[PDB]
Design a protein around this ligand. Structure first.
Ligand SMILES: [Zn+2]
Ligand SMILES: [Zn+2]
Ligand SMILES: [Zn+2]
Ligand SMILES: [Zn+2]
Ligand SMILES: [Zn+2]
Ligand SMILES: [Zn+2]
Ligand SMILES: [Zn+2]
Ligand SMILES: [Zn+2]
Lengths: 89, 49, 82, 76, 447, 90
């Protein structure tokens, strides 16, 4: 069943590890310049499409923004989540 | 110019020429015509004041 | 799902406005500056603005005296200072 | 009492002083150790520059406090 | 000519509906400012349909308690099935219209909804910032050798905490003297007034600067701009004067100062003194600081300079008797951070002393990061602690002669160069290529 | 169904959430600026490092002047401090 996901998420929230994950991810993306790259991407797309409509701009930004995420941060954060998951199953 | 480039009103060229031609030494540094043009501007200011 | 997590911890009908009560009892909070670490490593009376360059400064200018006013400062400026 | 001074390189030195000792005397001692004239010295404590004619007690400066030494970089 | 959403306009055609909306928005934002992380996750980021957290943006319903995700279109489904076209993004409080397919960011009333009750008056008495003045950008002319002042003033011109303070009218509200030719803070407020607003009712925008200069002349003529001087000394002098004016503003044994400087810039260093034998001890001294001065010699990176700053020392000239081993020892000294400031100010010690009594400038490039992690300097595990670079002061020349320039970052990520009267656009990478003398870092993330 | 897949979904959830937040903030800001300021123009950038944000060069001092309020005298600005040293000396 899919109640599992919500249950697991509830445990995750209650344990304190979510703050650590979210924060470490944010720190990595911030420090490596990815956040600002995504800001620049958003301005560029707004200028190219001559639009501030959120849905259509997002439609072009999100896939690319996802690709722009460094491999290091990806594997490190995945590694950390996996470490927290390997705890209680 | 150079009066501009030093925020001076006084002709840095004229001055560098006058320094070179009046036979005080073989070579003449770059700072001295500016420093001096400055002291000159200063004093004509104090007087006109 | 393992019985021990559920044991002491554990469409919805609940409502977010239920939080008003908590909001009533809760000190000013920041989204991504953890409070306890701020307590440990920072001073007790520090001023804090989260993401200060997110957008340009939000303020308005008095038509009468021309002062730039923070949103929380406009009203009394209008009452007895202009 | 002994106090400390963090010099330009980051090296810390120790001075022996009394609470009633003047900032001038301390600067004299620094000149005597480092060979730097008083007019070239800037002495910093608690975010403030220490001023001649005043005492250590005037700035609530106590035993084993550390002062931070800098020079002047003139511009304009 | 950007338009606004007509759907919210229709609602706004009725005053009581509008008032209900604004009241609820204000209440919601108060909740957002007064809700712990877990309640927010569980009650604003949980999809009512799939119960997933952070399935893209999660939207909080304006009319009921339902939360709906973006990725699986579940709020979108709430909108199609129940008819609620407006939802609030739980990451930023911004309101989405699913008809426009766009957020509503350009309605002043919505952006400033806390003043909604007084909005008419707010719109009659006050205007939005003028395009020209909105960022407060203006140069301060050299009135002799005043660049060491103006570059600093430009960094002061860009601090959000300071701007919040000044615009809050705190000094204005409490000043017992109320004259900018005597009060430094009044003069500052006048500067802010000139740069962001309009005095009633080419030489433009220099009045406040002239007032500041007049105060400076009155307290210490040497630092007032005729002669070349040190920007750091001026910094400490002026912040001390600001503090004195704050203290002056009291109506009435209170060692920690409660002023804007001391609630922003004051931290504390921990100095440990330990016996090399017993290695237990220690004699700990706590020293307040308003800024940090770092050695830069033989180094290429800011982290190297902080490491040197933070490096342990063995005293070879200290008279010492250990109480645990009862013997004379050469003590070990160490500096660490006890408390960090909200805004961290760094001075690079770009000078050295020679045996002949002369000094020399250090022109060495020191690499500095766009984002700075202070975690390695906290004494007591320590979580990640990251600051954002917002300011640089650079000097060109020698110890006894030169020029100061400032670099400031504003919203959107663009850098500007402040060279007396000249404000110009600059890229981040070039700022990062600058020879830094002073660096200003604002706290961004605390883990 | 595996740990790896669910983890990938969690990461995608987090990233799309953050992205949507940043983009929403950007779009709201630009919408606001353009609506508030229909005639909005970018600040001037000079590759030569000569022109200001309005595309102008550093103005000529001492061509500019200031009217000194203490004595009513106009004084060239780059000598203003000097004047004040001579003016406040009352
Ligand atoms: Zn007013
Ligand atoms: Zn609903
Ligand atoms: Zn969902
Ligand atoms: Zn709409
Ligand atoms: Zn005042
Ligand atoms: Zn204070
Ligand atoms: Zn011992
Ligand atoms: Zn006058």
């Amino acid at each position: 069943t899919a109640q599992l996901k919500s249950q697991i998420q509830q445990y995750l929230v209650e344990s304190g590890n979510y703050e650590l994950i979210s924060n470490e991810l944010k720190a990595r993306l911030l420090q490596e310049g990815w956040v600002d790259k995504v800001k620049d991407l958003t301005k560029s797309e707004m200028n190219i499409n001559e639009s501030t409509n959120f849905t259509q701009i997002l439609s072009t930004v999100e896939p690319k923004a996802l690709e722009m995420v460094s491999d290091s941060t990806r594997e490190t954060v995945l590694k950390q989540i996996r470490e927290f998951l390997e705890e209680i199953v | 110019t150079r009066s501009s480039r030093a925020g001076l009103q006084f002709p840095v060229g004229r001055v560098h020429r006058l320094l070179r031609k009046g036979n005080y030494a073989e070579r003449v540094g770059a700072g001295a015509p500016v420093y001096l043009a400055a002291v000159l501007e200063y004093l004509t200011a104090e007087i006109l004041e | 799902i393992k019985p021990k997590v559920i044991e002491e911890y554990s469409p919805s009908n609940d409502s977010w406005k239920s939080l008003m009560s908590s909001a009533k009892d809760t000190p000013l909070q920041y989204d991504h500056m953890n409070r306890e670490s701020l307590k440990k490593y920072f001073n007790p009376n520090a001023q804090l603005i989260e993401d200060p360059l997110d957008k340009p400064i939000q303020y308005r200018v008095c038509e009468k005296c021309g002062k730039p006013l923070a949103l929380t400062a406009i009203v009394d400026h209008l009452e007895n200072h202009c | 009492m002994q106090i400390f001074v963090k010099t330009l390189t980051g090296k810390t030195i120790t001075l022996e002083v009394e609470p009633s000792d003047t900032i001038e005397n301390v600067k004299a001692k620094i000149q005597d150790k480092e060979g730097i004239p008083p007019d070239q010295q800037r002495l910093i404590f608690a975010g403030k520059q220490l001023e001649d004619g005043r005492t250590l007690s005037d700035y609530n400066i106590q035993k084993e406090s550390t002062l931070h030494l800098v020079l002047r970089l003139r511009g304009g | 000519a950007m338009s606004i959403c007509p759907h919210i306009q229709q609602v706004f055609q009725n005053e009581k509906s509008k008032d209900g909306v604004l009241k609820t928005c204000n209440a919601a934002r108060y909740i957002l400012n007064h809700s712990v992380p877990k309640e927010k996750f569980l009650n604003t980021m949980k999809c009512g349909t799939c119960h997933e957290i952070n399935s893209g943006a999660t939207f909080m319903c304006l009319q009921c308690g339902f939360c709906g995700c973006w990725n699986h279109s579940h709020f979108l489904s709430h909108s199609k099935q129940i008819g609620h076209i407006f939802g609030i993004n739980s990451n930023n409080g911004l309101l989405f219209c699913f008809k426009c397919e766009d957020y509503i960011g350009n309605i002043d009333l919505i952006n400033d909804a806390i003043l909604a009750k007084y909005w008419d008056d707010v719109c009659t008495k006050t205007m939005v910032p003028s395009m020209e003045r909105r960022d407060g950008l203006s140069g301060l002319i050299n009135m002799g050798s005043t660049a060491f002042m103006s570059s600093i003033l430009q960094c002061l011109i860009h601090n959000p905490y300071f701007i919040r303070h000044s615009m809050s009218q705190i000094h204005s509200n409490n000043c017992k003297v109320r004259s900018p030719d005597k009060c430094f803070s009044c003069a500052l407020d006048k500067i802010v007034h000139e740069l962001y607003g309009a005095l009633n009712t080419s030489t433009n925008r220099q009045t406040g600067f002239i007032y500041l200069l007049t105060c400076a002349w009155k307290i210490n003529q040497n630092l007032a701009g005729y002669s070349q001087q040190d920007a750091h000394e001026f910094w400490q002098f002026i912040i001390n004067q600001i503090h004195q004016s704050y203290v002056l503003d009291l109506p009435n044994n209170n060692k920690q100062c409660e002023c804007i400087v001391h609630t922003v810039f004051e931290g504390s260093l921990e100095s440990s003194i330990v016996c090399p034998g017993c290695q237990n001890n220690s004699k700990t001294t706590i020293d307040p600081f308003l800024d940090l001065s770092l050695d830069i010699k033989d180094k290429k990176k800011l982290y190297e300079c902080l490491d040197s700053f933070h490096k342990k020392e063995q005293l070879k000239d200290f008279n010492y008797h250990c109480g645990e081993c009862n013997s004379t020892q050469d003590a070990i000294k160490q500096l660490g951070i006890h408390k960090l400031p909200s805004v961290l100010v760094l001075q690079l010690k770009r000078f050295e002393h020679l045996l002949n009594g002369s000094n020399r400038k250090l022109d060495d490039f020191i690499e500095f990061p766009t984002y700075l992690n202070m975690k390695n300097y906290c004494s007591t595990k320590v979580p990640d602690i990251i600051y954002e670079l917002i300011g640089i002061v650079s000097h060109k020349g020698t110890v006894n002669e030169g020029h100061y320039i400032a670099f400031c970052k504003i919203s959107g990520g663009q850098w500007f160069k402040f060279n007396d009267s000249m404000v110009s656009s600059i890229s981040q990478e070039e700022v990062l290529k600058e020879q830094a003398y002073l660096l200003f870092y604002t706290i961004r993330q605390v883990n | 169904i595996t740990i790896d897949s669910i983890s990938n979904g969690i990461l995608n959830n987090l990233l799309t959430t953050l992205i949507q937040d940043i983009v929403a903030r950007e779009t709201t800001q630009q919408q606001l600026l353009k609506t508030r300021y229909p005639d909005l123009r970018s600040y001037y950038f000079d590759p030569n490092g000569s022109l200001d944000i309005n595309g102008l060069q550093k103005q000529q001092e001492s061509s500019q002047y200031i009217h000194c309020e203490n004595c009513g005298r106009d004084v060239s600005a780059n000598r203003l401090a000097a004047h004040l040293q001579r003016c406040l000396s009352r």
